[PDB]
């Protein structure tokens, strides 16, 4: 019995120093935290994309203003994800192909669809599209962002006022160093540069101590595994099985690099690009003077040399001189994220391809659930079981959503895209698609107030993947309901007054397009 | 078998029938012909109905009926909480609270949400002090301001009309049914037919084709709404849908009720419903204007009808040979599926549970809200029916589990009834909630402590109907408390110290409202 006195974090990556900062802040003055980190071969900064709650749920919790960490991490702004060439056959190219008299792209923006007479705007859009009253795509009809993103507009005016929900693009290595300084200098976290040599467990299977290569022994009451894919504690020591979920996600490898960019000549894109490839997809994360890019592919349909060739040719890079990072990740999650006195945080717990910018979210979302379910020395099993339940739902819901990107793509030109259609959706995901086809919303938000959504982590965590996200991806790829929502035929006044709702989006599209500065213009004044 | 619903037939009148006619008539105004089949039954006494705050915001506001309009026409009173009397002390069934720890054996279940302090509900701070001997005040008096003003029969609104707390209403159901009958027929164009169902004609698909009445009239429709009560003329008799008896969780199955005249000038009016524990059940008291309704809900396995009538009459000093009494034998449980084919069951034809927590009328307009949200066309898409049945199934089962906890966790052991309740088993969903509760966790904590958002957004409340505030009121009120304080509080020394001002604010509101609020009788006099 007694409270947790000492906490040992194994691993000093991005997740490791987020755990040290979050736990150091949450338990300030009531727990001694030590982080074990061994020097590894450093890698390139291939870029990271995030979601709006990174500020409200993480940096706000630490008490760090957005401007403070943005300037020290050379971060850019992210307004949406631009899905390129997901509906047209062809090689992997950065240029959008032609589809129905226009470029093959669609946006997944932040925020929530507006409610009109208790019904999301998506249902009103499809009702018009189904009956031939409109041909405008879903994203351009219901969101104001696509128009200003086509012109690389900034999410904030020169006076600082924000006109849309946005996230950030940055190099994870810089944020890790920023949080390393914050945790050690402000929160009293102890940093130890050593390599784990032996993990000693007791008769109950719990971790007793960790011995390093130099002979130092570190004991604690609670151990946090941030060692990445290796899982030194949760997998190696605790012997907890890892659940491979490649029966839903075929991608398991990646080739990534960083490419210099002339922001003065071309501006900066306020969005992440997800460019469909022949055996996967390639991300593009614009930053300051450069952009990170990585080809996520499936080793079952493309060899590493084929992926390196495809990746370099699309960006006009020299495969013999370009610095490249070749990665082979494990897709899935542990059977239990928390076992005994060992809590897994980061890629040691779970991993999925960064198609929807969930990597960093998984860290501080798990850290949020860890503090909410924080135990004492008795390690109450109810706290551990409920934490493991939240983590498995957080990941499995994301896994199902990511699979829908490939499962519902109309492409059939390569074995990769054809095989994705041969996989089976999870029962929870298949039920969601059944609702969608019936004209229902999928996890409709309780309110269309984005400030409440992104300002209340509990409100968002219970409704992380909401109707707005599903319609952006499903309707963007071409999946639409079999027929309009049957209740709209009983709402003649609602379907008539909705004209002003679509007109309001058109007016904001025109006004913001004409008045907003470019992202490059704002970044220049922002970053000095 | 396509096209929108054109004709809707409601079988059964009363409260459920005319609530369905009003809600569906308003939602589908001008796009559906609605006919209500009602046969004259032997009328019963007005034994009183208790409600919850969303009755105005989710039902009457949807109809466009101001609170003052329907209150005056139904002679309604105000309800601020439920006072549970004699649930922790042994003895006969009496209206007088017994002595417990130097005070009356009662505790309140109030409306609203517990205030958050540093992201933690106030209940966790209360028990932390109680566990460490820092306080002896009961949970309800420490965290709620209502118990103090309810002990003095204070009004929930000042004489100037300003409301000082969340409240509901007390009324005779028959008056509300007549009010809605006039509203639906005169304002919404609903057709009322006085006839008795003679034969229900089904087709080869199992769907209802038409209904023939005793006079030979045949009524056909596209969608049928069963509001026939416990008889289940359509859902059970015609559709042959099985009814799931749940007497393994709730032993009460009978009731003896009446109405008692009351001199409001001499004794005032109680702004709360009373739940008076009995030897083989419990007795309600629903104060109204010049009278109060009362009913002894009991278990036929432990008390005969004559024993319950005697217990009921003796506690109110009534003549068992002359007092007008209503003897009822209800079915406890729910249908296997609330909606089958083109037949949707609404009201007690769908499910029933004892009115211990004032959920009877709520079940009607909550189901009507889910019916419109899942409204079908002539094709009757099975996904709409399946999702509706799931929402109804969760709505009742969660209520069933909560109601059982009232008896399961009562410390009384003096009668075979109370002893047998401890021999039943809680549902797995309820047992897991109790496991969390004992572990110091909240049970379905609200996303926000803003009651206006909660009671103003039916979707927000429906997803969190039984929240942490409700569970703590009943469980801690009966004496069930966690095994130890939340381990997370030991790491928040500043939070556990600054919470002193939160409890002091409740004490200041208790003192100020007690001195300035008028009595309910005083406010009712000026209003009515
Ligand atoms: N609730 C999350 C859901 C989400 C996860 N990844 C996203 C990426 C984009 Br682009 C838009 C939304 C999300 C949000 O609205 O930010
Ligand atoms: N969310 C519901 C829960 C509830 C159902 N019946 C109740 C009865 C009382 Br008294 C208080 C709360 C409830 C409310 O607070 O109105």
Note whether A289 and A313 are within 8 A (CB). Answer: no
Kind of pairing between the strands at B7-11 and B223-226: parallel
Report the residue among B357, B474, B475 best suited for mutation to probe ligand 2: largest number of ligand atoms under 8 A from its CB: B357
Tell me which residue of B458, B466, B461 sits closest to B429, measured CA to CA: B466
User: What is the distance between the terminal CA atoms of chain A, rounded to a whole angstrom?
Assistant: 53
Q: How many CB atoms lie within 10 A of CB A34?
A: 18
* Residue B158 tokens, joined: 């000042």
> DSSP E strands: which ranges in B336-464?
339-340, 343-345, 351-352
Nearest by CB to residue A30, choosing from B27, B384, B490, is B490
List of residues 6+ apart from B315 with CB closer than 8 A: B92, B93, B94, B95, B276, B278, B283
* Contact between residue B4 and residue A489 where contact means Cβ atoms under 8 Å apart: yes
The three-state secondary structure class of B411 is coil
Which residues of chain A are at the B interface, by a Cβ-Cβ cutoff of 8 Å? Answer: 3-4, 26-27, 29-31, 371-376, 380, 382-383, 386, 434-435, 437-438, 440, 444, 446-447, 452, 456, 458-459, 462, 483, 486-487, 489-492
Cα separation, A441 vs A118, whole angstroms: 11
Enumerate residues 6+ apart whose C-beta is below 8 A from A65. Answer: A59
Q: B301 exposed, middle or buried (CB, 10 Å; 0-12, 13-18, 19+)?
A: middle
Phi-psi label, residue B519: left if phi above 0, alpha if psi -120 to 50, beta otherwise:
beta
A350 DSSP β-pair partners:
A333
Nearest to B460 among A371, A446, A486 (CB): A446
Q: Residue A518 and residue B81: Cα distance in Å, rounded? A: 57
Q: Which residues of B touch A27 (CB under 8 A)?
A: 491
C-beta of A269 in contact with ligand 1 (< 6 A): no
Pairing of strands B33-38, B7-11: parallel
Chain A residues whose beta carbon lies within 8 Å of the beta carbon of residue B488: 371-372, 374
Q: How far apart are CA B278 and CA B354, in angstroms?
A: 14
CB contact under 8 A, B447 and A440: no
Neighbour tally for A447: CB within 10 Å: 18
Three-class secondary structure of residue B412 per DSSP: coil
Going by alpha carbons, the residue nearest to atom 6 of ligand 2 is: B357
Q: Which two tokens stand for residue A125?
A: 């859009």
Q: Which residues, 6 or more positions from B490, have their beta carbon under 8 angstroms from its beta carbon?
A: A3, A30, A376
| Cβ-proximal residues to B92 (8 Å cutoff; 6+ apart), any chain | B279, B311, B315
Residue B174: closest CA among B46, B299, B269: B46
Contact A487 B441 (CB under 8 A): no
Q: Name the minimum distance, in Å, from the CA of B490 to any CA of chain A.
A: 7
User: What are the tokens at B151?
Assistant: 């002990």
Give the span between the Cα atoms of B480 and B474, in whole angstroms: 9
A506 assigned to active site: no
Cβ–Cβ below 8 Å for A435 and B28: no
Q: From CA A362, how far away is CA A360, in angstroms rounded?
A: 5
The pair of structure tokens assigned to B306 is 């004559």
CA atoms within 13 A on the CB side of B111: 27
| Per-residue exposure over A46-67, b if at least 16 CB sit within 10 Å of its own CB, e if not | bbbbbbbbbbbbbbebbebeee
Q: Residue A111 Cα, ligand 1 centroid: separation in angstroms? A: 8
Question: How far apart, in whole angstroms, are the C-alpha atoms of residue A503 and residue A348?
Answer: 48
Direct distance between the N- and C-terminal alpha carbons of chain B, in angstroms, rounded to an integer: 52
Centroid of ligand 1 to alpha carbon of A482 (angstroms): 26
A240 in a labelled binding site: no
The CATH code of the domain that includes A130 is 3.50.50.60
Other residues' Cβ atoms within 10 Å of the Cβ of residue B145 = 22
Nearest atom in ligand 1 to A460's CA: 1
Range of the domain at B442: 3-528
Which experiment gave this structure? X-ray
Instruction: Give Cβ neighbours of residue A317 (< 8 Å, ≥ 6 apart).
Output: A257, A259, A311
Residue among B492, B494, B475, B491 nearest B483 (CA): B475
The answer to whether B316 and B294 are in contact (CB under 8 A) is yes
Nearest to B25 by CA among B177, B174, B211, B187: B187
CA angle centred on A166, ends A160 and A168, rounded to 5°: 95
Using a CB-CB distance cutoff of 8 angstroms, which residues of chain A are in contact with residue B375? 486-487, 490
- Going by the DSSP 8-state scheme, the letter that residue A233 receives in this structure is I
Torsion angle defined by CA atoms of residues A449, A451, A454 and A456, in that order, rounded to the nearest 10 degrees: -100
List beta partners, residue B10: B36, B225
Q: Is B194 helix (H, G, I), strand (E, B) or coil?
A: strand
Name residues whose C-beta falls within 8 Å of residue A114's C-beta, 6 or more positions apart in sequence: A120, A121, A142, A448, A501
Q: How far apart are CA B377 and CA A255, in angstroms?
A: 50
Specify whether the CB–CB gap between B437 and B323 falls below 8 A.
no
Task: Tell which residue, A227, A187, A180, has the closest CA to residue A207.
Answer: A227
Provide the angle, in degrees to the nearest 10, between the axes of the packed helices B382-408 and B468-478. 30
Of the candidates A404, A386, A400, A277, the one whose C-alpha atom is nearest the C-alpha of residue A337 is A386
The dihedral built from the CA positions of residue A340, A341, A347 and A350, taken in this order, carries a sign that is positive
Long-range contacts of A175-181 (CB under 8 A, 24+ apart): A175/A14, A175/A48, A175/A69, A175/A73, A176/A12, A176/A13, A176/A14, A176/A16, A176/A17, A178/A69, A178/A72, A178/A73, A179/A17, A179/A18, A179/A20, A179/A21, A180/A12, A180/A17, A180/A20
What distance in Å separates the CA atoms of residue B496 and residue B473, rounded to the nearest whole number?
21
Contact, A486 vs A121, CB < 8 A? Answer: no
Query: B30 contacts in A (CB within 8 Å)?
Result: 492
Within 10 A of A360 (CB to CB), how many other CB atoms are there?
24
Question: H or E stretch including A130?
Answer: helix A121-130
Resolution in A: 2.7
Element (H, E) at B525: helix B520-527
A272 is in an annotated binding site: no
Contact A406, A417 (CB under 8 A): yes
**Residue B322: is it exposed, middle or buried by C-beta count within 10 angstroms (0-12/13-18/19+)?**
exposed
Tell me the C-alpha distance between A221 and A32, whole Å: 10
* DSSP assignments along B40-108, one per residue: ---------EE--THIIIIIIHHHT--HHHHHHHHT-EEE-EEEEESSSS-S---SSPPEETTEESEEE
> What is the SS3 assignment for A452-475?
HHHHCHHHHHCCCCCHHHHHHHHH
How many CB contacts within 8 angstroms connect chain A with chain B? Answer: 91
Percent composition of chain A: helix, strand, coil (DSSP 3-state, to 5): 40, 20, 40
β-bridge mates for residue A297, sequence order: A253, A280
Q: How many CB atoms lie within 10 A of CB A512?
A: 20
Are B368 and B24 in contact by the 8 Å Cβ rule? The answer is yes
Distance A51 CA to ligand 1 centre (A): 6
- Contact predicate B391/B370, CB 8 Å: yes
The pair of three-digit structure tokens given for residue B340, joined into one six-digit string: 């089958």
Q: What residue owns the CA closest to ligand 1's atom 1?
A: A464
Best A120, A438, A449 residue to mutate vs chain B (most B CBs within 10 Å) = A438
User: Interior CA angle at B454 toward B449 and B460, to 5°?
Assistant: 115
Q: Which of A366, A352, A330 is nearest to A397 (CA)?
A: A352
Cβ B97 vs Cβ B86: under 8 Å: yes
For residue B392, which of B339, B319, B469, B327 has the smallest C-alpha distance?
B339
Domain count, chain A: 1
- DSSP state at residue B114: P
Of A64, A52, A78, residue with least CA distance to A18: A64
Q: Which atom of ligand 2 is nearest to the CA of B467?
A: 1
Neighbours of A261 (CB within 10 A): 18
Cβ distance of A440 and B372 shorter than 8 Å: no
A343 annotated ligand-binding residue? no
Nearest partner of A402 among A37, A144, A83, A3, judged by Cα = A83
- Checking DSSP bridges between strand A272-276 and strand A80-84, what pairing results, if any? parallel
Residue A300 CA to residue A280 CA, distance in Å, equals 11
Helix A467-477 × helix A427-437 angle, to 10°:
80
A237 SS3 class: helix
Three-state SS at B219: strand
List the Cα angle B29/B31/B37 in 5-degree steps: 75
Q: Which chain B residues touch A456 with a CB distance below 8 Å? A: 447-448
Q: How many residues are recorded in chain B?
A: 528
Tell me the sheet residues that pair with A84: A105, A275
Residues pairing with B339 in the sheet: B344
Interface with chain B: mutation pick from A5, A25, A382, highest number of B CBs within 10 Å: A382
Label residue B24 exposed, middle or buried (CB < 10 Å: 0-12, 13-18, 19+): buried
> Contact at 8 Å (CB) between B198 and B209?
no
Chain mean position to CA B370: 17
For residue B428, the CA-to-ligand 2 centroid distance in Å is 22
Give the whole-angstrom CA distance, residue B83 versus residue B474. Answer: 11
The span from the CA of B267 to the CA of B250, in Å, is 35
Cα B11 to averaged position of ligand 1 atoms, centre (Å): 46
Handedness of CA A331, A336, A340, A341 (dihedral sign): positive
The alpha carbon of B380 is separated from its chain's Cα centroid by a whole number of angstroms, namely: 31
* Contact between chains at A380 and B439 (C-beta distance less than 8 A): yes
* Residue B277, CA distances (Å) to A154, A479, B415, B478 in order: 65, 57, 12, 12
Pick the catalytic residue: A25, A78, A114, A432? A78
State the burial class of residue A230 (Cβ atoms within 10 Å of its Cβ: 0-12, 13-18, 19+): middle
CA distance B38 to A237: 71
| Distances from the Cα of B278 to the Cα of A88, B86, B144, B404, B522, angstroms | 72, 8, 27, 16, 32
Here the tokens at position A366 are 């798990």
Give the integer Cα–Cα distance in Å for A106 and A281: 15
CB hemisphere CA count around B262 (13 angstroms): 20
Residue B225 structure tokens: 């709404």
Beta carbons of B30 and A492 less than 8 Å apart: yes
Nearest CB partner across the interface for B4, out of A383, A459, A486 = A486
The Cα–Cα gap between A80 and A389 comes to 30
- Cβ atoms within 10 Å of A518's Cβ, excluding its own: 16
- For A145, the enclosing helix (H) or strand (E) is helix A145-150
Give the separation between CA A123 and CA A501, rounded to whole angstroms. Answer: 13
H or E, element range at B500: helix B500-516
Chain B residues in contact with A487 (beta carbon < 8 A) = 372-373, 375
Q: Helix A427-437 to helix B382-408 angle, to the nearest 10 degrees?
A: 120
Classify residue A270 by burial, with Cβ atoms within 10 Å: 0-12, 13-18, 19+: buried
Query: CA A253 to CA B474: how far, in whole Å?
Result: 54
Q: Are B46 and B170 in contact (CB under 8 A)?
A: no
List, in order, residues 6 or more apart from B387 with CB less than 8 Å away: A435, A440, B374
Longest Cα separation, chain B: 77
Strand (E) or helix (H) holding A82:
strand A80-84
Location of structure tokens 């278990």 = B299
**CB distance B40 to B197 below 8 Å:** no
- Contacts of B212-216 with C-beta under 8 Å, sequence gap 24+, read B213/B37
Alpha helices in A438-528 (DSSP H): 450-455, 457-461, 467-477, 492-497, 499-515, 519-526
């Amino acid at each position: 019995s007694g409270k947790i006195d000492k906490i040992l974090i194994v691993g000093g990556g991005t997740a490791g120093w987020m755990a040290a900062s979050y736990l150091g802040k949450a338990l300030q003055g009531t727990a001694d935290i030590t982080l074990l980190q061994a020097p590894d071969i450093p890698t390139l900064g291939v870029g990271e994309a995030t979601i709006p709650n990174l500020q409200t749920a993480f940096f706000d919790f630490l008490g760090i203003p957005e401007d403070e960490w943005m300037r020290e991490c050379n971060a850019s702004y992210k307004v949406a994800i631009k899905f390129i060439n997901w509906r047209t056959a062809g090689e992997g190219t950065s240029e959008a192909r032609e589809l129905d008299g226009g470029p093959d792209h669609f946006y997944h923006s932040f925020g929530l669809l507006k409610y009109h007479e208790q019904i999301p705007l998506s249902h009103y859009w499809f009702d018009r599209s189904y009956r031939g009253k409109t041909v405008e795509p879903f994203d351009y009809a219901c969101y104001k962002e696509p128009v200003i993103l086509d012109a690389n507009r900034s999410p904030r005016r020169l006076d600082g006022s924000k006109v849309t929900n946005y996230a950030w693009h940055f190099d994870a290595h810089l944020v890790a160093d920023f949080l390393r300084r914050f945790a050690t200098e402000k929160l009293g976290v102890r940093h130890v540069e050593d390599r784990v040599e032996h993990v000693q467990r007791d008769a109950n299977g719990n971790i007793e101590s960790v011995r390093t290569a130099t002979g130092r022994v570190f004991d604690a009451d609670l151990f946090v595994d941030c060692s990445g894919f290796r899982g030194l504690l949760i997998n190696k020591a605790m012997e907890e099985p890892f659940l491979d979920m490649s029966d839903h996600l075929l991608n398991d490898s990646a080739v990534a690099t960083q490419v210099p960019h002339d922001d003065d000549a071309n501006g900066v894109e306020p969005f992440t690009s997800a460019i469909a490839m022949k055996s996967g997809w390639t991300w593009k994360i614009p930053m300051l003077g450069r952009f990170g890019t990585g080809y996520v592919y499936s080793s079952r349909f493309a060899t590493e040399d084929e992926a390196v060739r495809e990746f370099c040719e699309m960006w006009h890079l020299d495969p013999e001189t370009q610095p490249l990072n070749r990665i082979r990740f494990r897709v899935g999650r542990n059977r239990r994220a928390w076992v005994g006195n060992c809590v897994s945080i980061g890629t040691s717990s779970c991993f999925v391809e960064p198609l929807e910018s969930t990597g960093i979210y998984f860290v501080y979302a798990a850290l949020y659930q860890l503090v909410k379910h924080f135990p004492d020395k008795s390690l109450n099993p109810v706290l551990t079981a409920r934490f493991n339940r939240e983590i498995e739902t957080m990941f499995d819901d994301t896994r199902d959503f990511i699979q829908a990107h490939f499962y519902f793509s109309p492409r059939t030109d390569t074995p990769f895209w054809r095989a994705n259609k041969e996989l089976r959706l999870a029962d929870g995901m298949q039920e969601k698609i059944d609702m969608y086809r019936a004209g229902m919303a999928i996890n409709a938000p309780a309110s269309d107030d984005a400030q409440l959504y992104y300002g209340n982590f509990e409100e968002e965590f219970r409704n992380f993947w909401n109707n707005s996200n599903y319609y952006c991806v499903l309707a963007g790829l071409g999946l639409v309901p079999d027929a309009p929502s049957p209740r709209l035929a009983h709402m003649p006044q609602a379907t008539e007054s909705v004209d002003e709702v679509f007109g309001a989006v058109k007016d904001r599209q025109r006004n913001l397009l004409e008045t907003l500065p470019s992202l490059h213009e704002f970044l220049r004044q922002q970053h000095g």
